[PDB]
Structure 1
Amino acid sequence: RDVFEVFSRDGTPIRGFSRPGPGETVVLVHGVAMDRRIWAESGFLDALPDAHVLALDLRGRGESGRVGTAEGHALRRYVEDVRAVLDRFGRARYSLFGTFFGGRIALQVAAVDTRVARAFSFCAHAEQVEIPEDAVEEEAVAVEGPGGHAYLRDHFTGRGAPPWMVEACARVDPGELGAATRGLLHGSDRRTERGHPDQELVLITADGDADLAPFHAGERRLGAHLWLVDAPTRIKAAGRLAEVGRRVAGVLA
């Protein structure tokens, strides 16, 4: 692995790693309370034998620049972070894969960037969502204070998340957890669109997902393919991420 830095539109430095390979160029986008270490820890990275893998830390996470404001965590800024990585590696074709909100980011990048040949969204769909202001603010308060890491650790432990997902939360600055949560009130609720006709769009979720309807909506509206894994909930589906990586490898091959 080599490390890289690029700058987003708003000047935020975005840091990541590049794992060279002779195959397709894949860009990996982590979830909110995560960083780029999850790709190796989940076994997803090992499941892609040939790809040139680019894994970024989104703003405010990992080794990327701090933000600390709700507006600085607007979805459009994350999209800019990812597009800056596409610029650095200069390819005409990329395949994006994102987990949870990272999947939503990947879908939005696909909508706006014609260099995205494929986008895979794990446990996030493409449809418009309702984002209640009170629930957002309550969650932001719960994650940003002294007890915020413990709150998330307990939440994910009680819901059966894999250990790497439980542990990643404590690596995120609490102020960035709060600001990222509040960032949802700046555009995150709009549906995503297909970027161009030849793009391959894939949604993945738990077969037991309590809200599969919007995943089927994306099949109809975007021509996305839906992949299911054996799990009762989206959080538990994260235990299957390496297995999903093997199926991604089959597409890239």
Structure 2
Amino acid sequence: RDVFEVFSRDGTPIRGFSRPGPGETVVLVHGVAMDRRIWAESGFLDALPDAHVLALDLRGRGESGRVGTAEGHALRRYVEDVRAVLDRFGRARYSLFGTFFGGRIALQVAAVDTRVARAFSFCAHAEQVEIPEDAVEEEAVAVEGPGGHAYLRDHFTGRGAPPWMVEACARVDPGELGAATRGLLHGSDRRTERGHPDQELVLITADGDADLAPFHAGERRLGAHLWLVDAPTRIKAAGRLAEVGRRVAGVLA
């Protein structure tokens, strides 16, 4: 692997690694309480032996620049972070894969960037959502205080999340966990659109998902394909991420 640095529209440095390969160029986008290490720890990276893999730390996470404001964590800023990575490696065609809110980010990048030939959203759909202001603020307070890492650790452990997902929360600054949570009130509630007719859009979730409705809505509205994994919940579906990587490798082949 080589490391890289790019700059987002608002000047935030975005750091990541590039794993060279002769195949498709794949850009991986992690979730809120994660960083770029989850791709190797989940086994997703090893499931793609031929791809040229680009994995970034989103703003405020890992080795990327700190933010510390709610508006600095607006969805549009994450989109700009990812598009800056697409610029650095100069390809005309990219395949994006994102986990949880990283899936929402990947879908929105696909909507605005004609260089995205494929977008895969793992355990997130593309539809408009209602975000309760009070509950999200409550959650921001819980995750940003001294007990925030334990709060997330206990929540994810209790819901059967994989160990790498539990452990990743403690590597995110508490202040950025709070700011990213509040950032969801700045645009993340809108649906995503199809970027161009030839795009391959894929949604993935647990076959036991208690709310599959919006995933089917994405099939109808965007012409997206729906992949299911054997799990009772979205969090437990994260235990299937390496398996999903193998299926992604099949598409890329």
Q: How does 1:100-111 map to 2 (within 5 A)?
A: 100-111=100-111
1:42 CA displacement: 0.2
Aligned mates of 2:247, 2:96 — CA distance in 1: 14
Q: Count the aligned residue pairs.
A: 253
1:3 aligns with 2:20: no
* TM-score normalised by the chain length of structure 2: 1.00
1:96 CA displacement: 0.1
Aligned mates of 1:184, 1:100 — CA distance in 2: 13
Deviations 1:79-134 (CA, angstroms, capped at 9, x unpaired): 00000000000000000000000000000000000000000000000000000100
Aligned mates of 1:217, 1:79 — CA distance in 2: 23
Deviations 1:137-186 (CA, angstroms, capped at 9, x unpaired): 00000000000000000000000000000000000000000000000110
Aligned mates of 1:212, 1:159 — CA distance in 2: 19
Aligned mates of 1:34, 1:76 — CA distance in 2: 19
SS in 1 for 2:43: coil
User: What is the root-mean-square deviation of aligned Cα atoms in Å?
Assistant: 0.2
Aligned mates of 1:212, 1:63 — CA distance in 2: 35
1:252 CA displacement: 0.2
Structure 2 unaligned blocks of 5 or more: none
Structure 1 unaligned blocks of 5 or more: none
Deviations 1:58-94 (CA, angstroms, capped at 9, x unpaired): 0000000000000000000000000000000000000
**Counterpart of 2:171?**
171
1:30 aligns with 2:53: no
SS in 2 for 1:211: coil
SS in 1 for 2:55: strand
Q: How does 1:195-214 map to 2 (within 5 A)?
A: 195-214=195-214
Aligned mates of 1:205, 1:184 — CA distance in 2: 21
* TM-score normalised by the chain length of structure 1: 1.00
Moved over 6 A (4+): none
1:216 aligns with 2:216: yes
Aligned mates of 1:3, 1:131 — CA distance in 2: 36
Deviations 1:179-212 (CA, angstroms, capped at 9, x unpaired): 0000011000000000000000000000000000
Aligned mates of 1:185, 1:139 — CA distance in 2: 12
Aligned mates of 1:132, 1:164 — CA distance in 2: 29
Aligned mates of 2:171, 2:121 — CA distance in 1: 23
Aligned mates of 2:2, 2:187 — CA distance in 1: 34
